[PDB]
């Protein structure tokens, strides 16, 4: 029983190596997968015979392995997702109080779940702080109602745990943007058992495995809400034109091969809007290389304009402009891991100075992060000062603390460095 | 009034006489001034050597250009000094 | 060969990685593709010149997916345009939703994002050569001290490239100090080579130039 | 010269003695400096961590960089 709690870090250890390794799988097999032909879905089974049988295993192991990363998963960044949350409420009703005094309000329930657990005993479980809820009531309850305010306060090993807490961090962890994903992930296993051919669909972790990819779909993704409106105009556009061409040149509308033939002739609208949906907005060429030119026809100077002005509108300006969007998109990053790396080289980053004060002595910025500040070094403190016992400080390990308690933030240094300050 | 009277010798010598700046001893800035070979001018003044150059300044400047600035650039005084080396056996 | 040339390629391969990989995204996807029509609208693919006739009708995956990466990727017109518009068939509106999410979801996205990967990378390499000629004309180069300070006098920074240091001019010192034989250093001289021979490379100045030096 | 004497003391713990800065009770520029414990040193320094730093900064002077950027950090 006890190297559940070993093996379970062992799976933790490994758990970015073991989805780089289950994406090896999600090739492997699915490579397999490009054999198949109907005859029913015969598999191929070039040369080896025992290809086939080989590829069995790797089902099973592949989704074993989805399976299994999420367990690490649930014990590595979970908890840390479980955990600023917490801190995110554990403040606010410290501070803000919300629940003492607002309500969230109808969105963002995922703020609002928190009314649940917050009624749990277990709650700060995470945070290492378990008396916040004490300290929370000192505050704001001597206002009103201090027990008021406690309402809303306060093998058996499968029964010791609690429920309300355990409900809530369940869903939690549904709200992830990348457990959901792994769960997923692990789901299309389980129909990679029920077909195979689902299973395919594990490749498109490489969107988010490699990281240059991920770069190339935040390349799309962040301008997507901007994006994807453009095929809404897009649609509407050539629904535009669908309402015209359904009000004149139906006529011209022969799908017939080549013609005297019954063709359909996409005069029902729901064809004749899908038909400039489709071949249409494919057109290359325009949708008048798709249906049989005009000639002669006093409806044809009127007809041409219709092409043209859908060619510009729609395939020279419209892709374009998906086109583009992509690439400001594409060229906006640039610019902004450009200005990242330019702003911590010039202002420090705590202190606000930037980088032409700390020229006065060599490399002196430079000096200006590694020892003045290099960022870190308050963290490694903010750690020190969590280990120590409070008896322990030094006036500043303290003052530190103290101001950390109560959240001013005021101490860490804002324009004054140590250089500036003397001489 | 001297180095106005003294100009014939500065006309001449200004091409290739050397300043430099340096952090000295002193540990202000003492500022020196080297002989240059004449050769040296005009070598550094026209072949491979300039685009060298600013195969050098484009190096340092969209890269490495913390403390590393002054060791990379040593670095191209030292290449640069062995390229023209390799001219002079020529 | 062409210097010009050097420049445009250059454009291409310092994003290179990041374009290739990009190509492997237009397999895998296209590849998705490919699944999705083998298990369904297989019926469609006839290669049939015109029709009832035994064209293999790319159902041997491999073919179907090479019929998908060629005339697929080429498609302009998409994936459809190469393969039989399908009409009053059950299937015909999932798939006429599968050939317009591939002709976004490839053509007009994954070319597009080759297209503007090179263009932000032509544009990146405008961007850089701007920048580094930016900062040798604001600040010095060994100094640091900035094309501001320079000001005080009548094309000063010009000055401080020229004469305060130019930048050869401590490679022509650097020269004179290896040319030299030991005895011969001033103690400037000297110094230089000492502190050049332990390699702490402090000696170049650092934002204390001359000018500001001094008044 | 004294502190040229105890080298050997300095230079094993340069990395990781820790210094930092607060704007003390003093409202001048008090430094302090805090023990390091040695795990951390390299804790920091090698794993998600290092980059999941740049996750950070990219955070910050990108978006929210007012006061929130102490109070964020
Ligand atoms: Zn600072
Ligand atoms: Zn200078």
């Given at each position: 029983?006890?190297?559940?709690?070993?093996?379970?870090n062992?799976?933790?250890r490994?758990?970015?190596?073991?989805?780089?390794?289950?994406?090896?799988?999600?090739?492997a097999?699915?490579?397999?997968?490009?054999?198949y032909?109907?005859?029913?879905?015969?598999?191929?089974?070039?040369?080896?015979?025992?290809?086939?049988?080989?590829?069995?295993?790797?089902?099973?192991?592949?989704?074993?392995?989805?399976?299994?990363?999420?367990?690490?998963y649930?014990?590595?960044?979970?908890?840390?997702?479980?955990?600023?949350?917490?801190?995110?409420?554990?403040?606010?009703?410290?501070?803000?109080?919300?629940?003492?005094?607002?309500?969230?309000?109808?969105?963002?329930?995922?703020?609002?779940?928190?009314?649940?657990?917050?009624?749990?005993?277990?709650?700060?479980?995470?945070?290492?702080?378990?008396?916040?809820?004490?300290?929370?009531?000192?505050?704001?309850?001597?206002?009103?109602?201090?027990?008021?305010?406690?309402?809303?306060?306060?093998?058996?090993?499968?029964?010791?745990?609690?429920?309300?807490?355990?409900?809530?961090?369940?869903?939690?962890?549904?709200?992830?943007?990348?457990?959901?994903?792994?769960?997923?992930?692990?789901?299309?296993?389980?129909?990679?058992?029920?077909?195979?051919?689902f299973?395919?669909?594990?490749?498109?972790?490489?969107?988010?495995?490699?990281?240059?990819?991920?770069?190339?779909?935040?390349?799309?993704?962040?301008?997507?809400?901007?994006?994807?409106?453009?095929?809404?105009?897009?649609?509407?556009?050539?629904?535009?034109?669908?309402?015209?061409?359904?009000?004149?040149?139906?006529?011209?509308?022969?799908?017939?091969?080549?013609?005297?033939?019954?063709?359909?002739?996409?005069?029902?609208?729901?064809?004749?809007?899908?038909?400039?949906?489709?071949?249409?907005?494919?057109?290359?060429?325009?949708?008048?290389?798709?249906?049989?030119?005009?000639?002669?026809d006093?409806?044809?100077?009127?007809?041409?304009?219709?092409?043209?002005?859908?060619?510009?509108?729609?395939?020279?300006?419209?892709?374009?402009?998906?086109?583009?969007?992509?690439?400001d998109?594409?060229?906006?990053?640039?610019?902004?891991?450009?200005?990242?790396?330019?702003d911590?080289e010039?202002?420090?980053?705590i202190?606000?100075?930037?980088?032409?004060?700390?020229?006065?002595?060599?490399?002196?910025?430079?000096?200006?992060?590694?020892?003045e500040?290099?960022?870190?070094?308050?963290?490694?403190?903010?750690?020190?000062?969590?280990?120590?016992?409070?008896?322990?400080?030094?006036?500043?390990?303290?003052?530190?603390?103290?101001?950390?308690?109560?959240?001013?933030?005021?101490?860490?240094?804002?324009?004054?460095?140590?250089?500036?300050?003397?001489? | 009034?001297?180095?106005?009277?003294?100009?014939?010798?500065?006309?001449?010598?200004?091409?290739?006489?050397?300043?430099?700046?340096?952090?000295?001893?002193?540990?202000?800035?003492?500022?020196?001034y080297?002989?240059?070979?004449?050769?040296?001018?005009?070598?550094?003044?026209?072949?491979?050597?300039?685009?060298?150059?600013?195969?050098?300044?484009?190096?340092?400047?969209?890269?490495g250009?913390?403390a590393?600035?002054?060791?990379?650039?040593?670095?191209?005084?030292?290449?640069?000094?062995?390229e023209?080396?390799?001219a002079?056996?020529?």
């Amino acid at each position: 029983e006890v190297q559940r709690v070993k093996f379970l870090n062992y799976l933790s250890r490994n758990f970015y190596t073991l989805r780089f390794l289950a994406l090896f799988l999600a090739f492997a097999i699915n490579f397999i997968l490009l054999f198949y032909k109907v005859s029913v879905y015969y598999f191929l089974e070039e040369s080896t015979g025992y290809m086939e049988p080989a590829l069995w295993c790797l089902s099973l192991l592949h989704t074993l392995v989805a399976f299994l990363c999420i367990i690490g998963y649930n014990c590595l960044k979970v908890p840390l997702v479980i955990f600023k949350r917490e801190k995110e409420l554990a403040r606010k009703l410290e501070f803000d109080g919300l629940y003492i005094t607002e309500q969230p309000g109808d969105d963002d329930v995922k703020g609002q779940w928190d009314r649940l657990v917050l009624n749990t005993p277990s709650f700060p479980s995470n945070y290492w702080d378990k008396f916040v809820k004490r300290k929370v009531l000192d505050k704001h309850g001597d206002i009103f109602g201090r027990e008021r305010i406690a309402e809303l306060l306060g093998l058996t090993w499968l029964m010791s745990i609690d429920v309300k807490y355990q409900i809530w961090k369940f869903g939690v962890i549904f709200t992830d943007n990348s457990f959901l994903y792994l769960g997923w992930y692990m789901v299309m296993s389980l129909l990679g058992h029920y077909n195979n051919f689902f299973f395919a669909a594990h490749l498109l972790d490489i969107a988010m495995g490699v990281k240059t990819l991920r770069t190339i779909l935040s390349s799309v993704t962040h301008n997507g809400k901007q994006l994807v409106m453009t095929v809404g105009l897009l649609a509407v556009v050539v629904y535009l034109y669908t309402v015209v061409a359904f009000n004149f040149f139906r006529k011209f509308y022969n799908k017939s091969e080549d013609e005297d033939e019954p063709d359909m002739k996409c005069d029902d609208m729901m064809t004749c809007y899908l038909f400039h949906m489709y071949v249409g907005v494919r057109a290359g060429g325009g949708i008048g290389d798709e249906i049989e030119d005009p000639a002669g026809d006093e409806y044809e100077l009127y007809r041409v304009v219709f092409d043209i002005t859908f060619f510009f509108f729609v395939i020279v300006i419209l892709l374009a402009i998906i086109q583009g969007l992509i690439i400001d998109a594409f060229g906006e990053l640039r610019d902004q891991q450009e200005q990242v790396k330019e702003d911590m080289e010039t202002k420090c980053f705590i202190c606000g100075i930037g980088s032409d004060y700390f020229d006065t002595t060599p490399h002196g910025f430079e000096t200006h992060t590694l020892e003045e500040h290099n960022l870190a070094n308050y963290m490694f403190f903010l750690m020190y000062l969590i280990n120590k016992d409070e008896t322990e400080h030094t006036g500043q390990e303290s003052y530190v603390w103290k101001m950390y308690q109560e959240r001013c933030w005021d101490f860490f240094p804002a324009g004054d460095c140590f250089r500036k300050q003397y001489e | 009034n001297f180095l106005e009277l003294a100009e014939s010798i500065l006309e001449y010598f200004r091409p290739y006489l050397g300043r430099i700046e340096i952090m000295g001893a002193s540990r202000r800035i003492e500022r020196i001034y080297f002989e240059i070979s004449e050769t040296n001018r005009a070598q550094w003044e026209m072949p491979q050597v300039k685009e060298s150059k600013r195969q050098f300044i484009f190096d340092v400047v969209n890269e490495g250009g913390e403390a590393e600035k002054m060791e990379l650039f040593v670095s191209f005084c030292e290449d640069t000094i062995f390229e023209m080396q390799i001219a002079a056996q020529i």
